[PDB]
C-alpha cells in the first residue's frame, strides 16, 4: 500500500503528472499529501451505499496482491454474479493502469469504457490528488468510487453482502474476529509491505531492516502454523487471504526481483504446505494469474529491472498433496 | 565471454568507455618445465593478479593453494569495486593489496605496459613475468594447468589435480561445463532479450541436474580423485546461491536444494586451504555494486544463511 515503484506516477489536483518534485522529498511524502476513498457498503437501511445485487463494480489487476485480496474473497463468498469485475492491463507505463481488452486475461472498462484507470478517478473526484491504484470498488448508481482499500473492500465483501452470496462462508467468524483483526494488522508491515520496502529500497540500511524483519516475521508464523491449520487456527479467515496474496508471489517475484532471497517460501516446513492448502481451496486457483504477475513485476519496473526480462522462476507444484487436513 | 553492459575496453592502447571479444587480443604464452622454453618455472619470478570476486581468477587461487605455490608465486588482489577505469588497486580496503610490481593505480596500466597498443578487455587473472616485464598468460584454464603441472619442482604439497588415467575425462568435462554452467550464468545475467535468457537458464539447469545425477554415485567430477574440473565447477557453485541465483536471475532452484550438488560443494569447501580462498564479501560487493544496468541502486542482497562448514558424508565415497 505504502511503497511504490521508482517510476510510479500521480494525479495532482486532477492533473496527470510523471513526477511532482515538491511532494516527493523524504520517505513517502506524496502519500501524506494524498486523498483516498474510504466509503463503506453497509447493510443498513439508513446507510448511503446499501448492498444491492447488480450495482457495485470492481476494478482489479491479476498481478496486484492487494487487488487479489478482493478477488479471493469475491470467489470464496460467491459474489461474482452480484459484483461485476474488470481486469486492467498487467503492463503499465506513463499513463498508469490501462485497459487492453484484446490482451489475454484483460477486459474493457465495463462502466465508462475508459482507456486508463486515471480517467475513472477524475470522473469520481475532478480535483483529486492521489495514486491511481487497484483495487477500486465502483458504484454505478452514484457513479463514483466507493472504496479504494483492499483491507476494507475484502471486509465489506465478507460481512455485508450476505443476501447475495452463493456460499455460506464466514471469513470473519464469531469468536475469531479479534484475533483475525490482530493478525492482519501484524503481518501488514513486515510481510505485506515489507517485500516492497525491500524491493524499492534505495539505501542499504533500509533494505537490511526490511529483509531482517520480513524473514523474521515469516519464521514466526511458520512455527505458529505447525500446530494449527490456519493463521487464526481452526478456521479460514481474512487473515489467511492477506498472507496468501503475498506468499503466492514470493518465490516467483519477491525472492528474485525484489531481492528477498534469504529463503524460498517452499523451503519452510509449514508455510509451503499452508500455501498449497490455500491454493487448492476450491475457487482460489482460478484467481491466480501467474502470467499477469510475472509480466507486471519484471517489465513494469525499469529502475529495478532495466532490461525488463521476465525471470523463469522455480517449477512450483502448487497442486502437490498436503496433510494439513489433519489439523 | 559475457561481460557487463558498462564493461570498458582498451583500444589501440587507448582507454575508452564505448566502441568486442572477436576484435580483441589475448595473452596465451605458457610456463613450460623444459630447457628451451621462453618462460621456465622459477621460485620467485611470476606474479598473479586476481580478484576474490571473479570466479575465473578464483580458479588460479584454488590451484595455487592446493599445490603449495604460495611461496613460489606471489599474488595481488585488486579492488572488488570497479568503475570508469576498470579493475583498480585500493590497498586500504580489507582483503585488497597493492601492485607489488610497479605500484600501479589501475590494472589497465599493466596491460598497456606489457603491450603498448593492445586492443583488449582489462580482466583477471593475469600471470606476470617479473623478468621480461610482461604478461605471460591471460586465460583461467591455461594458468590453472600451468600451476598444476609445470611447477612440480617448487611445490609444497604432492597433489595432482590432473593425474594420468583421468586426464582425458578432466579436459572434456572442463569444456562441457564451460558454456552451459561456467559462462552460462553470465549469458543469462547480462541478457537483454527474453529468448537468450530462456535458453541460458534452460541449458544451465539442465547441466546442473546432470552432474547432480552423476555425483550421486561418484565423489568427484572425474570420478575417483579431486581434479581441475572440480575447480572450474566450484568457483561457480560457491557464487550461485548468493549471487547468480538472484542477481543474474538464475532462480529455478538453489544449489543447496540439490541432493548431491550441495554436499559436494561442502566437500570442496572444507578441503584444506580452499576455505581461505573464498572471500564472500568481495563476491557479494562486486556483483551488486558494479553492475548499474543489472542492479541500478547498487543494493547488496542478503542471501541465504549457507553453512559450508556443515558435516557431510561423501567421504563414504572413495576419494581424497
Amino acid at each position: 500500500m505504502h511503497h511504490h515503484h521508482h517510476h510510479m506516477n500521480m494525479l495532482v489536483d486532477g492533473e496527470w503528472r510523471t513526477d511532482a518534485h515538491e511532494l516527493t522529498a523524504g520517505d513517502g511524502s506524496f502519500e501524506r499529501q494524498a486523498t483516498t476513498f474510504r466509503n463503506w457498503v453497509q447493510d443498513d437501511s439508513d446507510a448511503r451505499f446499501q448492498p444491492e445485487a447488480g450495482r457495485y463494480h470492481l476494478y482489479v489487476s491479476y498481478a496486484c496482491p492487494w487487488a487479489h485480496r478482493t478477488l479471493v474473497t469475491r470467489t470464496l463468498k460467491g459474489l461474482e454474479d452480484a459484483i461485476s469485475v474488470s481486469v486492467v492491463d498487467p503492463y503499465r507505463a506513463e499513463d498508469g493502469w490501462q485497459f487492453t481488452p484484446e490482451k489475454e486475461g484483460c477486459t474493457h472498462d465495463h462502466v465508462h469504457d475508459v482507456d486508463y484507470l486515471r480517467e475513472l478517478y477524475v470522473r469520481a473526484a475532478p480535483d483529486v490528488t492521489c495514486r491511481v491504484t487497484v483495487p477500486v470498488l465502483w458504484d454505478t448508481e452514484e457513479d463514483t468510487i466507493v472504496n479504494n482499500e483492499s483491507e476494507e473492500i475484502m471486509r465489506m465483501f465478507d460481512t455485508e453482502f450476505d443476501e447475495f452470496a452463493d456460499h455460506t462462508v464466514d471469513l470473519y467468524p464469531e469468536g475469531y474476529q479479534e484475533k483475525v483483526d490482530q493478525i492482519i494488522d501484524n503481518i501488514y508491515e513486515p510481510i505485506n509491505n515489507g517485500v516492497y520496502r525491500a524491493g524499492f529500497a534505495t539505501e542499504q540500511e533500509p533494505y537490511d531492516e526490511a529483509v531482517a524483519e520480513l524473514f523474521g516475521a515469516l519464521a514466526h508464523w511458520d512455527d505458529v502454523l505447525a500446530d494449527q491449520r490456519y493463521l487464526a487456527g481452526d478456521r479460514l479467515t481474512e487473515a489467511d487471504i492477506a498472507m496468501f496474496t503475498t506468499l503466492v508471489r514470493f518465490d516467483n517475484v519477491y525472492h528474485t526481483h525484489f531481492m528477498c532471497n534469504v529463503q524460498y517460501i517452499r523451503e519452510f516446513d509449514n508455510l509451503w504446505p499452508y500455501l498449497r492448502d490455500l491454493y487448492q481451496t476450491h475457487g482460489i486457483a482460478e484467481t491466480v494469474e501467474m502470467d499477469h504477475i510475472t509480466e507486471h513485476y519484471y517489465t513494469t519496473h525499469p529502475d529495478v529491472n532495466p532490461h525488463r526480462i521476465v525471470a523463469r522462476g522455480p517449477d512450483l507444484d502448487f497442486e502437490a498433496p498436503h496433510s494439513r487436513d489433519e489439523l
Side-chain angles (χ1 to χ4, degrees), chain A residues 161-268:
Chain A
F161 287 88
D162 274 331
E163 184 168 329
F164 314 99
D166 294 341
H167 305 115
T168 316
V169 183
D170 188 15
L171 308 167
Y172 189 61
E174 154 209 15
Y176 293 93
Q177 296 175 356
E178 227 158 44
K179 175 62 78 181
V180 173
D181 295 320
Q182 187 195 68
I183 298 181
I184 295 169
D185 202 271
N186 189 346
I187 74 149
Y188 181 71
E189 212 195 311
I191 294 170
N192 291 338
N193 273 328
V195 284
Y196 293 87
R197 176 161 169 253
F200 306 140
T202 197
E203 299 170 317
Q204 188 60 47
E205 317 229 70
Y207 168 87
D208 295 335
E209 292 174 28
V211 172
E213 280 248 345
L214 169 57
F215 284 91
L218 289 172
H220 163 55
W221 292 112
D222 185 71
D223 295 340
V224 172
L225 287 181
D227 304 293
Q228 60 197 60
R229 179 171 185 168
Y230 303 115
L231 292 179
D234 197 35
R235 308 201 55 192
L236 193 72
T237 62
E238 298 185 6
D240 306 89
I241 302 187
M243 183 71 108
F244 168 79
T245 54
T246 298
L247 261 56
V248 75
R249 292 174 166 82
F250 201 101
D251 290 12
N252 270 93
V253 173
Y254 295 154
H255 187 288
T256 296
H257 181 57
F258 278 173
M259 263 169 271
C260 300
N261 64 340
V262 174
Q263 190 183 301
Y264 272 139
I265 288 297
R266 78 174 177 184
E267 283 190 294
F268 282 94

Side-chain angles (χ1 to χ4, degrees), chain A residues 53 62 71 103 107 265 326:
Chain A
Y62 277 119
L71 291 185
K103 193 168 182 176
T107 69
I265 288 297
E326 289 175 53

Side-chain angles (χ1 to χ4, degrees), chain A residues 135-153:
Chain A
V136 169
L137 183 64
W138 188 277
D139 179 36
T140 49
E141 190 101 48
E142 261 198 42
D143 195 36
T144 186
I145 303 176
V146 169
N147 199 278
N148 195 21
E149 306 277 339
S150 61
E151 167 176 322
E152 299 182 319
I153 296 179

Side-chain angles (χ1 to χ4, degrees), chain A residues 42-66:
Chain A
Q42 291 286 95
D43 200 340
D44 210 278
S45 43
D46 282 42
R48 178 177 168 185
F49 304 97
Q50 261 152 103
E52 294 186 32
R55 181 182 176 179
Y56 303 97
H57 189 69
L58 176 64
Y59 294 94
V60 297
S61 169
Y62 277 119
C64 193
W66 310 96

Side-chain angles (χ1 to χ4, degrees), chain A residues 11-217:
Chain A
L11 217 54
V12 178
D13 293 336
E15 296 290 325
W16 190 242
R17 307 206 178 140
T18 323
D19 192 330
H21 294 282
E22 77 274 359
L23 304 173
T24 57
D27 286 21
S29 65
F30 173 83
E31 338 299 317
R32 290 184 293 267
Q33 300 273 3
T35 302
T36 59
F37 299 78
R38 305 261 186 96
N39 282 288
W40 285 68
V41 179
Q42 291 286 95
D43 200 340
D44 210 278
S45 43
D46 282 42
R48 178 177 168 185
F49 304 97
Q50 261 152 103
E52 294 186 32
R55 181 182 176 179
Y56 303 97
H57 189 69
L58 176 64
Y59 294 94
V60 297
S61 169
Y62 277 119
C64 193
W66 310 96
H68 189 200
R69 258 138 75 144
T70 66
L71 291 185
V72 172
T73 303
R74 193 186 76 128
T75 311
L76 283 180
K77 230 60 176 64
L79 284 173
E80 311 91 335
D81 291 331
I83 305 170
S84 60
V85 59
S86 292
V87 181
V88 303
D89 194 341
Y91 178 87
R92 62 158 166 191
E94 319 93 35
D95 297 320
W97 291 118
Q98 68 181 4
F99 293 87
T100 315
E102 63 263 29
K103 193 168 182 176
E104 173 64 38
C106 318
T107 69
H108 66 278
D109 169 37
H110 293 80
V111 178
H112 292 303
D113 192 24
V114 298
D115 298 319
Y116 312 103
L117 199 73
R118 51 190 184 92
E119 297 176 62
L120 283 162
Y121 281 75
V122 172
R123 180 184 259 89
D127 196 46
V128 69
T129 296
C130 66
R131 301 270 193 189
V132 182
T133 61
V134 288
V136 169
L137 183 64
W138 188 277
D139 179 36
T140 49
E141 190 101 48
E142 261 198 42
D143 195 36
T144 186
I145 303 176
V146 169
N147 199 278
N148 195 21
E149 306 277 339
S150 61
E151 167 176 322
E152 299 182 319
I153 296 179
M154 168 166 66
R155 174 61 60 85
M156 68 182 76
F157 277 10
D158 194 21
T159 62
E160 307 300 293
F161 287 88
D162 274 331
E163 184 168 329
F164 314 99
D166 294 341
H167 305 115
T168 316
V169 183
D170 188 15
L171 308 167
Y172 189 61
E174 154 209 15
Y176 293 93
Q177 296 175 356
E178 227 158 44
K179 175 62 78 181
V180 173
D181 295 320
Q182 187 195 68
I183 298 181
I184 295 169
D185 202 271
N186 189 346
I187 74 149
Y188 181 71
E189 212 195 311
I191 294 170
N192 291 338
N193 273 328
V195 284
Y196 293 87
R197 176 161 169 253
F200 306 140
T202 197
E203 299 170 317
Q204 188 60 47
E205 317 229 70
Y207 168 87
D208 295 335
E209 292 174 28
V211 172
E213 280 248 345
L214 169 57
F215 284 91

